[PDB]
Coordinates of C-alpha atoms and ligand atoms in Angstrom, one line a residue:
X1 CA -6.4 9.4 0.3
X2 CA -2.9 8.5 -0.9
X3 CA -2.1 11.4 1.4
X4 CA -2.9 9.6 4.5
X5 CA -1.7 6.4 3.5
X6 CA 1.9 7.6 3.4
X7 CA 1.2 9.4 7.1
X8 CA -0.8 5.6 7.7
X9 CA 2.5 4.2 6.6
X10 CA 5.0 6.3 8.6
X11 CA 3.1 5.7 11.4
X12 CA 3.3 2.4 11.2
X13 CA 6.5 1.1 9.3
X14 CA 9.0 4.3 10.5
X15 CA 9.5 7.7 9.0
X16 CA 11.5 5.8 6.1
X17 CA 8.2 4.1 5.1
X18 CA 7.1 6.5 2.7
X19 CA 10.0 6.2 0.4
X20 CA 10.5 2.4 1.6
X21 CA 7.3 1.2 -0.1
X22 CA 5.9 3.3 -2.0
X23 CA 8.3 2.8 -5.5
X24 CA 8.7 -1.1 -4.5
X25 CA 8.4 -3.5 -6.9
X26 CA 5.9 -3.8 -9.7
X27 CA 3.1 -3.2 -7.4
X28 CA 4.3 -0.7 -4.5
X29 CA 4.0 3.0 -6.4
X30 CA 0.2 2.4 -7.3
X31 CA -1.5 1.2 -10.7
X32 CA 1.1 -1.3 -10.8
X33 CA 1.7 -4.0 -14.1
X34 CA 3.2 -7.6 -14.0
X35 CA 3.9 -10.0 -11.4
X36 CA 4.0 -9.1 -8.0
X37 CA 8.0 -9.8 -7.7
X38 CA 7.7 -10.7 -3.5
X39 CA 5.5 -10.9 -0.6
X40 CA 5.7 -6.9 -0.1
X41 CA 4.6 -6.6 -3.8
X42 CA 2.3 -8.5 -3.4
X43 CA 1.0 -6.4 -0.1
X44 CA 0.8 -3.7 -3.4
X45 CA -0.7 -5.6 -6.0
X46 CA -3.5 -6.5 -2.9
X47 CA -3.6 -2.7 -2.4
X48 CA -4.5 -2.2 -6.0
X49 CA -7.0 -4.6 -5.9
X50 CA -8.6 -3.2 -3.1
X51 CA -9.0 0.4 -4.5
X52 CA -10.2 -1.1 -7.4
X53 CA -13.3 -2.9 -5.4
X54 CA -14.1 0.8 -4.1
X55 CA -17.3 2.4 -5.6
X56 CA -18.6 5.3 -4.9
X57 CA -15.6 6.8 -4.0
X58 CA -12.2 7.7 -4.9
X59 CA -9.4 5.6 -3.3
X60 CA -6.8 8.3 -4.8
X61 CA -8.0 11.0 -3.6
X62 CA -11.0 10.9 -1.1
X63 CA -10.4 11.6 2.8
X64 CA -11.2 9.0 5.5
X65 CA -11.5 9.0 9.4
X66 CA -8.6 7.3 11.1
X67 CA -7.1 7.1 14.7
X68 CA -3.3 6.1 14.8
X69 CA -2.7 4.9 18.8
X70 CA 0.4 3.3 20.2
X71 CA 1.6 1.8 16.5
X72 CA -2.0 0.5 15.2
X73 CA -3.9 2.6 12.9
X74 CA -8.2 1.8 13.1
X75 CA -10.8 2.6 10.4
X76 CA -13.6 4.8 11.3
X77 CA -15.6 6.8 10.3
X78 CA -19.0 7.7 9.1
X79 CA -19.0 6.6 5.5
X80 CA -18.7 2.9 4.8
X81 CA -17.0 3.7 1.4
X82 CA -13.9 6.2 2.9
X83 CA -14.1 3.3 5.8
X84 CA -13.3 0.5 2.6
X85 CA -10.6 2.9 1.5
X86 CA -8.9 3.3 4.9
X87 CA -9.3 -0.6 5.2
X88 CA -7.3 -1.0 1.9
X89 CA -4.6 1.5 3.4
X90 CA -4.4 -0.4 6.9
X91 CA -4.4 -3.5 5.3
X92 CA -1.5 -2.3 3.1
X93 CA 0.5 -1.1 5.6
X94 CA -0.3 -4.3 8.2
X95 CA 0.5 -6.7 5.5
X96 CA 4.3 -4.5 5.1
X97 CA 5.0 -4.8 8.5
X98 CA 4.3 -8.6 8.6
X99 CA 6.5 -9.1 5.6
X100 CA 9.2 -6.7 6.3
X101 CA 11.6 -10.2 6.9
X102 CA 11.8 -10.6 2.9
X103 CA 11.3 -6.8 2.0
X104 CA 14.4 -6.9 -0.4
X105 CA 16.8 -3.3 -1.4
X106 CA 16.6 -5.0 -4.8
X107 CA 13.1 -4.0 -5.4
X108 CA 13.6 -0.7 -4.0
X109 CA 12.8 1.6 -7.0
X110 CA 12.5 -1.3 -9.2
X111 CA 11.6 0.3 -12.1
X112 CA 8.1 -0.4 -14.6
X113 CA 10.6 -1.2 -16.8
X114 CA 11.2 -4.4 -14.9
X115 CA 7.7 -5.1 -14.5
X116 CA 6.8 -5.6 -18.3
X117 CA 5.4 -8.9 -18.5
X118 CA 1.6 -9.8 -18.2
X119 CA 0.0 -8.2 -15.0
X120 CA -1.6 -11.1 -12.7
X121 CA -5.3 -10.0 -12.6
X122 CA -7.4 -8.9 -9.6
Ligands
CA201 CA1 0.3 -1.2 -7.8

């Protein structure tokens, strides 16, 4: 769930995370539009891309089976769909932390309104 993708990303990225990534650029915030404006975005736009593969479940909202241990987060659990989900989230959060060197303030609570051109597909 979205809920434990924040926790997924505090746990990983800082306390801060939560509000560091999750209005950032066109992408970061969920259900994005436009072009991914940097490599963080683009973590997003991935992220969006990935909930959107999930059937059978609800990316939103459904609960899945994590550890977090010493800075890594691992999917478990015993349904392969909440396991896809989690994957998306640790994905998400793994792909932040790799590009946190370009994460740029300016894309901090972009704004949709800067995001208006043609969304790149999945
Ligand atoms: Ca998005």
């Amino acid at each position: 769930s979205l809920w434990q993708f924040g926790k997924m990303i505090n746990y990983v990225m800082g306390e801060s995370g939560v509000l560091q990534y999750l209005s950032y650029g066109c992408y970061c915030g969920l259900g994005g539009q436009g072009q991914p404006t940097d490599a963080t975005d683009r973590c997003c736009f991935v992220h969006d891309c990935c909930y959107g593969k999930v059937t059978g479940c609800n990316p939103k909202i459904d609960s899945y089976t994590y550890s977090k241990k010493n800075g890594d987060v691992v999917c478990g659990g015993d349904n392969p769909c909440k396991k896809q989900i989690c994957e998306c989230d640790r994905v998400a959060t793994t792909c932040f932390r790799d590009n946190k060197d370009t994460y740029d303030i300016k894309y901090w609570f972009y704004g949709a309104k800067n995001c208006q051109e043609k969304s790149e597909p999945c």
